[PDB]
Design an enzyme around this catalytic site. Structure first.
Site, PDB file in Angstrom:
ATOM      1  CE  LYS A  99      70.286  15.202  -6.477  1.00 26.23           C
ATOM      2  NZ  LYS A  99      70.700  14.982  -5.056  1.00 26.23           N
ATOM      3  CG  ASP A 131      69.744  14.443  -0.637  1.00 29.90           C
ATOM      4  OD1 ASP A 131      68.932  15.208  -0.054  1.00 29.90           O
ATOM      5  OD2 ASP A 131      69.445  13.769  -1.646  1.00 29.90           O
ATOM      6  CG  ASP A 150      67.827  13.980   4.320  1.00 24.95           C
ATOM      7  OD1 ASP A 150      67.520  13.073   5.135  1.00 24.95           O
ATOM      8  OD2 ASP A 150      67.653  13.871   3.081  1.00 24.95           O
ATOM      9  NE  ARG A 191      67.630   9.212   3.618  1.00 25.83           N
ATOM     10  CZ  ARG A 191      67.292   9.224   4.904  1.00 25.83           C
ATOM     11  NH1 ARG A 191      67.307   8.103   5.614  1.00 25.83           N
ATOM     12  NH2 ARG A 191      66.920  10.355   5.487  1.00 25.83           N
ATOM     13  CG  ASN A 192      70.996  11.636   2.330  1.00 25.08           C
ATOM     14  OD1 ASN A 192      70.653  11.281   1.194  1.00 25.08           O
ATOM     15  ND2 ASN A 192      70.126  12.081   3.195  1.00 25.08           N
ATOM     16  CG  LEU A 204      74.356   5.313 -11.133  1.00 21.38           C
ATOM     17  CD1 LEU A 204      75.287   6.337 -10.571  1.00 21.38           C
ATOM     18  CD2 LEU A 204      75.080   4.010 -11.383  1.00 21.38           C
ATOM     19  N   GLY A 205      69.853   5.116  -9.920  1.00 20.70           N
ATOM     20  CA  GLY A 205      68.703   5.194  -9.030  1.00 20.70           C
ATOM     21  C   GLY A 205      67.521   5.978  -9.554  1.00 20.70           C
ATOM     22  CB  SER A 206      64.256   5.609 -10.136  1.00 24.28           C
ATOM     23  OG  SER A 206      64.946   5.402 -11.358  1.00 24.28           O
ATOM     24  N   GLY A 207      63.386   7.501  -7.736  1.00 20.46           N
ATOM     25  CA  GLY A 207      62.597   7.689  -6.526  1.00 20.46           C
ATOM     26  C   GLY A 207      62.073   9.091  -6.312  1.00 20.46           C
ATOM     27  CB  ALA A 208      61.508  10.814  -3.024  1.00 21.50           C
TER      28      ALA A 208
HETATM   29  C1  LIG Z   1      78.857   3.361  -9.568  1.00 21.52           C
HETATM   30  O1  LIG Z   1      78.075   4.442  -9.068  1.00 21.52           O
HETATM   31  C2  LIG Z   1      77.145   4.158  -8.108  1.00 21.52           C
HETATM   32  C3  LIG Z   1      76.542   2.927  -7.943  1.00 21.52           C
HETATM   33  C4  LIG Z   1      75.601   2.729  -6.932  1.00 21.52           C
HETATM   34  N1  LIG Z   1      74.994   1.499  -6.762  1.00 21.52           N
HETATM   35  C5  LIG Z   1      73.941   1.134  -7.712  1.00 21.52           C
HETATM   36  C6  LIG Z   1      73.075   0.005  -7.166  1.00 21.52           C
HETATM   37  C7  LIG Z   1      73.932  -1.200  -6.803  1.00 21.52           C
HETATM   38  N2  LIG Z   1      73.150  -2.345  -6.308  1.00 21.52           N
HETATM   39  C8  LIG Z   1      73.240  -2.514  -4.852  1.00 21.52           C
HETATM   40  C9  LIG Z   1      72.324  -3.631  -4.395  1.00 21.52           C
HETATM   41  N3  LIG Z   1      72.670  -4.889  -5.050  1.00 21.52           N
HETATM   42  C10 LIG Z   1      71.784  -5.965  -4.603  1.00 21.52           C
HETATM   43  C11 LIG Z   1      72.586  -4.721  -6.497  1.00 21.52           C
HETATM   44  C12 LIG Z   1      73.503  -3.608  -6.966  1.00 21.52           C
HETATM   45  C13 LIG Z   1      75.068  -0.799  -5.871  1.00 21.52           C
HETATM   46  C14 LIG Z   1      75.863   0.358  -6.463  1.00 21.52           C
HETATM   47  C15 LIG Z   1      75.283   3.795  -6.095  1.00 21.52           C
HETATM   48  C16 LIG Z   1      75.886   5.029  -6.258  1.00 21.52           C
HETATM   49  C17 LIG Z   1      76.823   5.223  -7.267  1.00 21.52           C
HETATM   50  N4  LIG Z   1      77.457   6.448  -7.471  1.00 21.52           N
HETATM   51  C18 LIG Z   1      76.958   7.678  -7.169  1.00 21.52           C
HETATM   52  N5  LIG Z   1      77.752   8.719  -7.457  1.00 21.52           N
HETATM   53  C19 LIG Z   1      77.255   9.921  -7.157  1.00 21.52           C
HETATM   54  C20 LIG Z   1      76.007  10.091  -6.588  1.00 21.52           C
HETATM   55 CL1  LIG Z   1      75.431  11.685  -6.227  1.00 21.52          CL
HETATM   56  C21 LIG Z   1      75.251   8.950  -6.324  1.00 21.52           C
HETATM   57  N6  LIG Z   1      74.015   9.072  -5.762  1.00 21.52           N
HETATM   58  C22 LIG Z   1      72.873   8.299  -5.958  1.00 21.52           C
HETATM   59  C23 LIG Z   1      72.861   7.211  -6.829  1.00 21.52           C
HETATM   60  C24 LIG Z   1      71.711   6.459  -7.004  1.00 21.52           C
HETATM   61  C25 LIG Z   1      70.561   6.778  -6.317  1.00 21.52           C
HETATM   62  C26 LIG Z   1      70.546   7.853  -5.447  1.00 21.52           C
HETATM   63  C27 LIG Z   1      71.692   8.629  -5.251  1.00 21.52           C
HETATM   64  P1  LIG Z   1      71.570  10.009  -4.095  1.00 21.52           P
HETATM   65  C28 LIG Z   1      72.132   9.386  -2.509  1.00 21.52           C
HETATM   66  C29 LIG Z   1      69.819  10.352  -3.909  1.00 21.52           C
HETATM   67  O2  LIG Z   1      72.388  11.135  -4.598  1.00 21.52           O
HETATM   68  N7  LIG Z   1      75.731   7.731  -6.617  1.00 21.52           N
END
Ligand SMILES: COc1cc(N2CCC(N3CCN(C)CC3)CC2)ccc1Nc1ncc(Cl)c(Nc2ccccc2P(C)(C)=O)n1
Length: 312
Positions: free
Chosen positions: A51, A159, A141, A145-146, A24-28
């Site tokens: 995570k 976070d 924080d 975003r959080n 779902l994500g990458s980074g710091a």
């Molecule tokens: C289905 O689940 C997700 C999908 C997305 N995104 C993924 C990119 C997607 N993009 C958007 C832009 N668009 C152009 C192209 C599609 C949109 C949906 C984001 C978040 C969750 N769920 C989720 N649960 C628990 C945590 Cl805890 C978390 N947290 C989390 C997820 C990812 C990175 C960072 C965190 P953090 C803040 C640092 O906890 N995140």
């Protein structure tokens, strides 16, 4: 006993009990994966977020401090820890918030978000933050975003990386060196590295601003070094086009130079609840009645607040 014992339970999970599905994500922070968690024996499947951060002893120390905080919290508007998995690198297991983070949601759905949604998110962020004030926690924080989205109707704060528990006597958290986001920081925090619940009220102001501007970068095109000076002069973030002076005066109050003059999170719940009872009187959005996502008995009931929203 100076402070009360923390009898929270830390649940440890087997790597076999859960299956990763995507990133779902990458980074710091490290990397967050989406998965399923089938607790052994129970005919139940739980959508989870896993995570992590190669192994470093300085990194695992910080992830276990976070798990400590997350396993201590229990509120509908706060993300809690489901458990921890003790593998090569320590994994944090939390609930999946299918709609992602609130910053990316407001950006994506910019033309479908109505006043009722925006004001309710404001009530919810405040309720979650008032819970943290009750548990003597300083998030340190708070930003859009959080804040994660379970449904467009239900948000939760995440976070707890920088979070600090304050002692029954302690009233300020004096930090040291460390990368802190300056654009969301209270003036006392940039000049003296002091953090209170009132410094979190400031960051709440900037979060409300991010939501109202449909995901704009505070002080866009301004280097970090300047923010301390700009704020010292008396300059604040601008009035968002959709904002009435009523909503903007709440934001402006969160930015008072005197911390004790700023609203308390329980006052913000009351103020945004009243506004959510007539949202069109407080936010001017073109097409409010067509914008979608997936009434009394006596005198003037303008100052009417439900008992659930009247905390103390
Ligand atoms: C289905 O689940 C997700 C999908 C997305 N995104 C993924 C990119 C997607 N993009 C958007 C832009 N668009 C152009 C192209 C599609 C949109 C949906 C984001 C978040 C969750 N769920 C989720 N649960 C628990 C945590 Cl805890 C978390 N947290 C989390 C997820 C990812 C990175 C960072 C965190 P953090 C803040 C640092 O906890 N995140």
């Amino acid at each position: 006993s100076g402070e009360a014992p923390n009898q929270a339970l830390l649940r440890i999970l087997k790597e076999t009990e859960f299956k990763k599905i995507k990133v779902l994500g990458s980074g710091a922070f490290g990397t967050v994966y989406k998965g399923l968690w089938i607790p052994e024996g129970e005919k139940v499947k739980i959508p989870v977020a896993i995570k992590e951060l190669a192994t470093s002893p300085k990194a695992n120390k910080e992830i276990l401090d976070e798990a400590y905080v997350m396993a201590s919290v229990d509120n509908p508007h706060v993300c809690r820890l489901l458990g921890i998995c003790l593998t090569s690198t320590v994994q944090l297991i939390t609930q999946l918030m299918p709609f992602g983070c609130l910053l990316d949601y407001v950006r994506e759905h910019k033309d479908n978000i109505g006043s009722q949604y925006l004001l309710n998110w404001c009530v919810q962020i405040a309720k979650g933050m008032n819970y943290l004030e009750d548990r003597r926690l300083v998030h340190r924080d708070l930003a859009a975003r959080n804040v994660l989205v379970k449904t467009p109707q239900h948000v939760k704060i995440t976070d707890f990386g920088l979070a600090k528990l304050l002692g029954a006597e302690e009233k300020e958290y004096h930090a040291e060196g460390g990368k802190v986001p300056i654009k969301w920081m209270a003036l006392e925090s940039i000049l003296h590295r002091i953090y209170t619940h009132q410094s979190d009220v400031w960051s709440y102001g900037v979060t409300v601003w991010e939501l109202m501007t449909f995901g704009s970068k505070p002080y866009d095109g301004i280097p970090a070094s300047e923010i301390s000076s700009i704020l010292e002069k008396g300059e604040r973030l601008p009035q968002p086009p959709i904002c009435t002076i009523d909503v903007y005066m709440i934001m402006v109050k969160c930015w008072m130079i005197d911390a004790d003059s700023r609203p308390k999170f329980r006052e913000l719940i009351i103020e945004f609840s009243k506004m959510a009872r007539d949202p069109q009187r407080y936010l001017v959005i073109q097409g409010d009645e067509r914008m979608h996502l997936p009434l009394m008995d006596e005198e003037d009931m303008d100052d009417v607040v439900d008992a659930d929203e009247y905390l103390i």
